[PDB]
């Protein structure tokens, strides 16, 4: 009954917002990451790192504001406030992109904090820790896209910037440069995300239209008591319906709910792997057989060759402004262009 | 086009001409589809987390449920008690009907908007 | 020396067979284009 | 098309090896009951 057990007592008290030991790591880091993003998007430019305006103060709106990445010349500097680049000058720190690493790093430790929180609360309440396990997929996505991907490239500059339109640019960049839509690891992520959303909607719909009549009103919500032992909808009728509509149906409620964990979690894990490859420019860019034929046979055309032309347009037309440290000067005559346009 | 790369061609041409990424109805679609995947994972993990012990370590817990049993197979108050503490109490459903209706509405409405 | 007490029967039901065969066949359908390249 | 010649065996073994595994497990499950 020393100080440690007294502290444990206090951290674990049943209050409106549970704290726990995990709170010590979660709550400062979540607050700071959130605070850095709101601070940067309200007040901080990207003029010196990107040549872009990116704050409300500069005239941007909610869709175009960003906390942008540091300049390619910072390499993978941690950009600590007290480090050799900003040298403890807060103002320079902001202008050099220091809020980006601030948000990325504090965000990473907040995600650790939150997953520890799912572990902590689950242990105290007495449940299996599957919600924490499921959260491993958001974590894998965050570290692979925000940390591993730029670490493989020349600098943080090519990580995503924290903003709505800036993430849109990130999407289009991955199309034009990595041909990311062609990557089977992304396709598995797509099937996992769309598979989840489908499962989500089809499971909620099914339950709501196989409800038992347990009250008398036209509002069926009131006819449920969270301590009742009885299932509130007919699994038997749901199984018949889907067996006759679709051919197969769930028959085991445990499998069904496990499957709902499995599908989107797996999907996200798969896309993270493909992003790890893209850190190295290990793209699924081409099909060699398609290119050998196309080079030799100028009448051979597929949707595959049509999409690479688009990629080549994206690269040449956005590169000068999207990578300003490279001083790309493309005179009009070198720009790839179809007829008239 | 009815094809995998044909689909991607459609998307790239569509973005160039309609700036669909910057359209609110696509953004709600992404929210319907990201949120759908999120709540799929959440709901699957909360129910799986609160399965009532019915089996040994050597067997799939799935055999703890028999098709057509009348009793529920998980403890929804334990699930509510975990999730209400993970966030805060009133940010959690204890009404299974409101919950499953929520699960139905979010991706359906989001995909309506993106359509 | 007695036989080993730690041995256990192993099972795969028909539904898991169908699920797994579906997984493998679609995974093959997805990657085969890339293997042929 | 000038496809990778080992793509065929890659694909055939990629299907055959895990499928056979599942079939072995399923059939010996059925002869238990």
């Amino acid at each position: 009954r020393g100080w440690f057990d007294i502290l444990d007592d206090w951290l674990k008290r049943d209050r409106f917002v549970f704290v726990g030991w995990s709170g010590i790591l979660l709550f400062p880091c979540a607050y700071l990451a959130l605070g850095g993003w709101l601070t940067g998007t309200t007040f901080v430019t990207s003029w010196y790192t990107h040549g872009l305006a990116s704050s409300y103060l500069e005239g941007c709106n909610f869709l175009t504001v960003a906390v942008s990445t540091p300049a390619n010349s910072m390499g993978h500097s941690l950009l600590l406030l007290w480090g050799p680049e900003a040298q403890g000058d807060f103002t320079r720190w902001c202008q050099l992109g220091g809020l980006w690493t601030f948000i990325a790093l504090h965000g990473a430790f907040g995600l650790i904090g939150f997953m520890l929180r799912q572990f902590e609360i689950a242990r105290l309440v007495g449940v299996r820790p599957y919600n924490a396990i499921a959260f491993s997929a958001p974590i894998a996505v965050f570290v692979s896209v925000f940390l591993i991907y730029p670490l493989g490239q020349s600098s943080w500059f090519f990580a995503p910037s924290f903003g709505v339109a800036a993430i849109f640019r990130f999407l289009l960049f991955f199309q034009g440069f990595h041909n990311w839509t062609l990557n089977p690891f992304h396709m598995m992520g797509v099937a996992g995300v769309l598979g989840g959303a489908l499962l989500c909607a089809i499971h909620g719909a099914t339950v709501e239209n196989t409800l038992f009549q347990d009250g008398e009103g036209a509002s069926t919500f009131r006819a449920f008591n969270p301590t009742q032992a009885e299932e509130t909808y007919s699994m038997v009728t749901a199984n018949r319906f889907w067996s006759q509509i679709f051919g197969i149906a769930f028959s085991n409620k445990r499998w069904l709910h496990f499957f709902m964990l499995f599908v989107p979690v797996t999907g996200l894990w798969m896309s993270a792997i493909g992003v790890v490859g893209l850190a190295l420019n290990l793209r699924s860019y081409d099909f060699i057989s398609q290119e050998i034929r196309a080079a030799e046979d100028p009448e051979f055309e597929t949707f595959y060759t049509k999409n690479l032309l688009l990629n080549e347009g994206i690269r040449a037309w956005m590169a000068p402004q999207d990578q300003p440290h490279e001083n790309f000067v493309f005179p009009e005559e070198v720009l790839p262009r179809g007829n008239a346009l | 086009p009815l094809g995998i790369s044909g689909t991607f061609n459609f998307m790239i041409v569509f973005q160039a001409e309609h700036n669909i990424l910057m359209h609110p109805f696509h953004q709600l679609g992404v929210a319907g589809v990201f949120g759908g995947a999120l709540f799929c994972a959440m709901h699957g993990s909360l129910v799986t987390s609160s399965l009532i012990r019915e089996t040994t370590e050597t067997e799939s817990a799935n055999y703890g449920y028999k098709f057509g049993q009348e009793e529920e197979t998980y403890n929804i108050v334990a699930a509510h008690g975990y999730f209400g503490r993970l966030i805060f109490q009133y940010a959690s459903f204890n009404n299974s009907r409101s919950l499953h209706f929520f699960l139905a509405a979010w991706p359906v409405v989001g995909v309506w908007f993106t359509a | 020396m007695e036989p080993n007490p730690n041995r256990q029967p192993v099972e795969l039901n028909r539904t898991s067979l169908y699920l797994g065969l579906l997984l493998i066949l679609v995974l093959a359908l997805l990657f085969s284009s890339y293997f042929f390249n | 098309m000038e496809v990778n010649q080992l793509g065929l065996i890659a694909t055939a073994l990629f299907v055959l090896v895990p499928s056979v595994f599942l079939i072995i497990l399923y059939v010996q499950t059925e002869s238990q009951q």
């Binding site: 051919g247 197969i248 | - | 039901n13 028909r14 169908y18 359908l29 085969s32 | -």
Partner: peptide, 30 residues
């Protein structure tokens, strides 16, 4: 050979559909 391979896999998936629907383990009540 790659066309044969693609169509072979696809046909195996359709046959599996047949068996998964018509030769499923029947769900029995309680």
């Amino acid at each position: 050979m790659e066309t044969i391979t693609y169509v072979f896999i696809f046909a195996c998936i359709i046959a599996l559909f047949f068996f998964a629907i018509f030769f499923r383990e029947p769900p029995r009540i309680t």
